């Protein structure tokens, strides 16, 4: 109206009809449920959007993610000839929108313009409104919904019941839209004092207030200004659930059927992918999706068998990821704690500990209820069975309890530590048993100091001196110290400073490696083993979304040739249990130039820094195209997606395989190509530690491509591997400075 209330006065009508409406946007821009999509539609509909206010609005898309609201608007953009009214941005900002728009049937009113993109987009929309239809169909399980849902039953002329087997892409996505849619000192002398009061009151805009009305500068600046506390909000923070529960019966609970069958992993993956972007999350989209997840979890929480039969951890690790997400912090965490009912899961593994660790992460950090919810998990912890496993992880809990809780875990941990009052090695073992989890355990340094308090068995440690190892438990501690170095809590260093009973050990210069399991895994042979290792490297993702991708490549890696070895390898491994549960015969491609990547030895030089650049050049290696293994190619994309070093680690093995592939090619090319890395030494150039990585490939040469055309000096074999100046590598080795290698590389040199 006040806009409808409105030359210089049309410029003022611009101020009064428009810039006020623009000002009016800032409030829609301000609060919530903005639904300025209606306004924005009206803004276009009134031509009140005509200012390139989107530019002004970009500040909100700045306050937001970019066109995130534009995306977010879709629900209302859908709700918005309201859509012909909504039509403004199709160029000015479509298939999913069409899929969102696909609801004309409940038809061709949508599908007319389908051809206007393509008439076969009926595929392109197939699930998404079918979801809305399924929603309506699930809503048909409730009325006037069934009307449009009957009107949707009409849409069903097409053949997609087969694609309905492909369905549940969207499965639960629609929880809101049907059901509660979008439902929300001397330094202070040296530095300053804060100024709040009447120093506040201790406090022209002609063109200014015009530049206020013009530019719409201030109110977005205002609206952007308020964009200021770290609170708890999700700690502080719709029954399609019935309908969600409902339409399963249409196929008779194919959700239950797919549960192990589709494994839901994709959906689980989606469930993560679902969560992905939300800053609305406060209670909102994520906290909504969280609840949705929490529900979806609770929903997932239904299945006793098929879900663990998909895999419980291939699920539950998501809970860990959720825990990670939880760690990434929400009182909703208690659902996990609730999920930590998990009695049919009662066999659950140190992911539990890791979780318990993650649990302990908040332990005293928590809010009392959460802390109670923790204490609950701690009482869930208090459950007796598999106590050793508990006793295994138990250690910090005492300290954690001690932090409280005081005996609560402690007495239990004591009870765990009452497995026996053994220390010297035992604590050492406990320190050896301190080897489990992620960044800050932080506890047993005290215990170590407490261990330190018993110094007698240092004599035993002395008496222990017959051997080749275990002071390096210190080194482990050092490694542990080295571990999480870049992370927070330097107090670890002070914790490490509880290692100060110190300096006296002996009988090695340097550090040591790990993963006898890999050596156990070294039972596996062909670089399929390296794959099986890479499978570990795959299993090295338990990790995270958008790293989530290669899980396909993993499932892609699950190809029978692989899977056979995997089946062969389906004897031993623990995560594999999740994997052949989760994942578990493939294809290959051609190329032209073995010379394709040749000059990239400059870029493969990672000549430029950010060896992600060289890792791009490592992608460039993946880009260098031939298959020793397609299994190489198998990740090669998700590899490029991967942590490239993590990938590029194999890239050497790949390169080794590529060497193993390369006949004269790298044999020639590596002469040049490696010469770059060799040349990378030049003039004291700058390459770091991917330089070492670049070096590290030598290890594969020193080991994997040590196998190359094998020869008696395996040097010769590695020379067979090698473009072979270790004399060159020496400088690198010297640059690497890490002598045992270097000297070896030198000894090689």
From Swiss-Prot:
Changing residue 126 to V: Found in a patient with early-onset breast cancer; uncertain significance. The keyword Glycosyltransferase does not apply. The keyword Nucleus applies. Residues 212-220 are annotated as: Interaction with ABL1. Changing residue 729 to L: Decreased phosphorylation of target proteins. GO terms for molecular function: 1-phosphatidylinositol-3-kinase activity; ATP binding; DNA binding; DNA-dependent protein kinase activity; histone H2AXS139 kinase activity; identical protein binding; protein serine kinase activity; protein serine/threonine kinase activity. Changing residue 749 to C: Found in a patient with familial pancreatic cancer; uncertain significance; also found in a lung adenocarcinoma sample; uncertain significance; decreased phosphorylation of target proteins. Changing residue 741 to R: In B-cell chronic lymphocytic leukemia. Coiled coil: none annotated. One of its GO terms (cellular component) is extrinsic component of synaptic vesicle membrane. Induction: By ionizing radiation. Phosphorylated by NUAK1/ARK5. During the late stages of DNA damage response, dephosphorylated following deacetylation by SIRT7, leading to ATM deactivation. Changing residue 704 to I: In a breast pleomorphic lobular carcinoma sample; somatic mutation. The modification Phosphoserine is found at residue 681. It is found in: Nucleus; Cytoplasmic vesicle; Cytoplasm, Cytoskeleton, Microtubule organizing center, Centrosome; Peroxisome matrix. Changing residue 698 to H: In T-prolymphocytic leukemia. Changing residue 291 to S: Found in B-cell non-Hodgkin lymphoma; uncertain significance. Keywords: Acetylation, ATP-binding, Cell cycle, Cytoplasm, Cytoplasmic vesicle, Cytoskeleton, Disease variant, DNA damage, DNA-binding, Kinase, Neurodegeneration, Nucleotide-binding, Nucleus, Peroxisome, Phosphoprotein, Serine/threonine-protein kinase, Transferase, Tumor suppressor. Its main location: nucleus. Signal peptide: none annotated. The FATC domain is required for interaction with KAT5. Belongs to the PI3/PI4-kinase family. ATM subfamily. It is linked to Ataxia telangiectasia: A rare recessive disorder characterized by progressive cerebellar ataxia, dilation of the blood vessels in the conjunctiva and eyeballs, immunodeficiency, growth retardation and sexual immaturity. Patients have a strong predisposition to cancer; about 30% of patients develop tumors, particularly lymphomas and leukemias. Cells from affected individuals are highly sensitive to damage by ionizing radiation and resistant to inhibition of DNA synthesis following irradiation. Homodimer. Dimers or tetramers in inactive state. On DNA damage, autophosphorylation dissociates ATM into monomers rendering them catalytically active. Binds p53/TP53, ABL1, BRCA1 and TERF1. Interacts with NBN (via FxF/Y motif). Part of the BRCA1-associated genome surveillance complex (BASC), which contains BRCA1, MSH2, MSH6, MLH1, ATM, BLM, PMS2 and the RAD50-MRE11-NBN protein complex. This association could be a dynamic process changing throughout the cell cycle and within subnuclear domains. Interacts with RAD17; DNA damage promotes the association. Serine/threonine protein kinase which activates checkpoint signaling upon double strand breaks (DSBs), apoptosis and genotoxic stresses such as ionizing ultraviolet A light (UVA), thereby acting as a DNA damage sensor. Recognizes the substrate consensus sequence [ST]-Q. Phosphorylates 'Ser-139' of histone variant H2AX at double strand breaks (DSBs), thereby regulating DNA damage response mechanism. This is Serine-protein kinase ATM. It comes from Homo sapiens (Human). The gene is ATM.
């Amino acid at each position: 109206r006040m806009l409808a209330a409105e030359s210089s006065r049309l410029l003022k009508a611009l101020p009064l009809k428009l810039q006020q409406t623009a000002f009016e946007n800032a409030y829609l821009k301000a609060q919530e449920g903005m639904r300025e999509m209606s306004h924005s539609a009206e803004n276009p509909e009134t031509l009140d959007e005509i200012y390139n206010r989107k530019s002004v609005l970009l500040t909100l898309i700045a306050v937001v993610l970019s066109c995130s609201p534009i995306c977010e608007k879709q629900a209302l953009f859908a709700l918005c000839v309201k859509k012909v009214l909504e039509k403004v941005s199709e160029t000015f900002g479509m298939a999913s929108h069409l899929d969102y728009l696909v609801l004309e049937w409940l038809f061709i009113l949508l599908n007319y313009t389908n051809i206007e993109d393509f008439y076969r987009s009926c595929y392109k929309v197939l699930i998404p409104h079918l979801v809305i239809r399924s929603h309506f169909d699930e809503v048909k399980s409730i009325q006037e919904d069934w009307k449009s849902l009957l009107t949707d039953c009409f849409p069903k002329i097409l053949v997609n019941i087969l694609p309905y087997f492909a369905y549940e892409g969207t499965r639960d996505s629609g929880m809101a839209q049907q059901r509660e849619t979008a439902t929300k000192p001397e330094i202070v002398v040296e530095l300053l004092m804060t100024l709040h009061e009447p120093a506040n009151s201790s406090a022209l805009c002609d063109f200014s207030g015009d530049l206020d009305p013009a530019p719409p500068p201030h109110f977005p600046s205002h609206v952007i200004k308020a964009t200021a506390y770290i609170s708890n909000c999700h700690k502080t923070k719709k029954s399609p659930d019935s309908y969600q529960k409902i339409l399963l019966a249409i196929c008779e609970q194919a959700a239950e059927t797919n549960n192990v069958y589709k494994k839901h992993r994709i959906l689980k993956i989606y469930h993560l992918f679902v969560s992905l972007l939300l800053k609305d999350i406060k209670s909102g989209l994520g906290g909504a999706w969280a609840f949705v997840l929490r529900d979806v979890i609770y929903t997932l929480i239904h299945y006793i068998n098929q879900r663990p039969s998909c895999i419980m951890d291939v699920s539950l690790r998501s809970f860990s990821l959720c825990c990670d997400l939880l760690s990434q912090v929400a009182l909703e965490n208690h659902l996990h704690v609730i999920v930590g009912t998990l009695i049919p899961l009662v066999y659950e593994q140190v992911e539990v500990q890791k979780q318990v660790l993650d649990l302990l992460k908040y332990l005293v950090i928590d809010n009392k209820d959460n802390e109670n919810l923790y204490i609950t998990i701690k009482l869930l912890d208090p459950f007796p069975d598999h106590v050793v496993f508990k006793d295994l992880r138990i250690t910090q809990q005492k300290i954690k309890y001690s932090r409280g809780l005081e005996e609560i875990n402690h007495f239990l941990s004591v009870s765990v530590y009452d497995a026996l009052p053994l220390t010297r090695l035992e604590g050492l073992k406990d320190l050896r048993r301190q080897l489990e989890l992620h960044k800050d355990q932080m506890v047993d340094i005290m215990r170590a100091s407490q261990d330190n308090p018993q110094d007698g068995i240092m004599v035993k440690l002395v008496v222990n001196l017959l051997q080749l190892s275990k002071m390096a438990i210190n080194h482990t501690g050092e490694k542990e110290v080295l571990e999480a170095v870049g992370s927070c809590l330097g107090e670890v260093g002070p914790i490490d400073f509880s290692t100060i009973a110190i300096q006296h050990s002996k009988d090695a210069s340097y550090t040591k490696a790990l993963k006898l399991f890999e050596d156990k895994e070294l039972q596996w042979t062909f670089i399929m083993l390296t794959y099986l290792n890479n499978t570990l490297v795959e299993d090295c993702v338990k990790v995270r979304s958008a790293a989530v991708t290669c899980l396909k490549n993993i499932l892609a890696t699950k190809t029978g040739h692989s899977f056979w070895e995997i089946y062969k390898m389906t004897t031993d491994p623990m995560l594999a249990y999740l994997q052949p549960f989760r994942t578990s015969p493939l294809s290959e491609n051609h190329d032209i130039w073995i010379k394709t990547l040749t000059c990239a030895f400059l870029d493969s030089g990672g000549t430029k820094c950010e060896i992600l650049q060289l890792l791009k050049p490592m992608c460039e290696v993946k880009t260098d195209f031939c298959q020793t293994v397609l299994p190489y190619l198998i990740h090669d994309i998700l590899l490029q997606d991967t942590n490239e070093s993590w990938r590029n680690l194999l890239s050497t093995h790949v390169q080794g395989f590529f060497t193993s592939c390369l006949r004269h090619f790298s044999q020639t090319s590596r002469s040049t190509t490696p010469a770059n890395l060799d040349s990378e030494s030049e003039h004291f150039f700058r390459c770091c530690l991917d330089k070492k990585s670049q070096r590290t490939m030598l290890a594969v040469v020193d080991y994997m491509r040590r196998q190359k055309r094998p020869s008696s000096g395996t040097i010769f074999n590695d020379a067979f591997w090698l473009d072979l100046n270790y004399l060159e590598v020496a400088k690198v080795a010297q640059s690497c400075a890490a002598h045992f290698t270097a000297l070896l590389y030198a000894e090689i040199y």
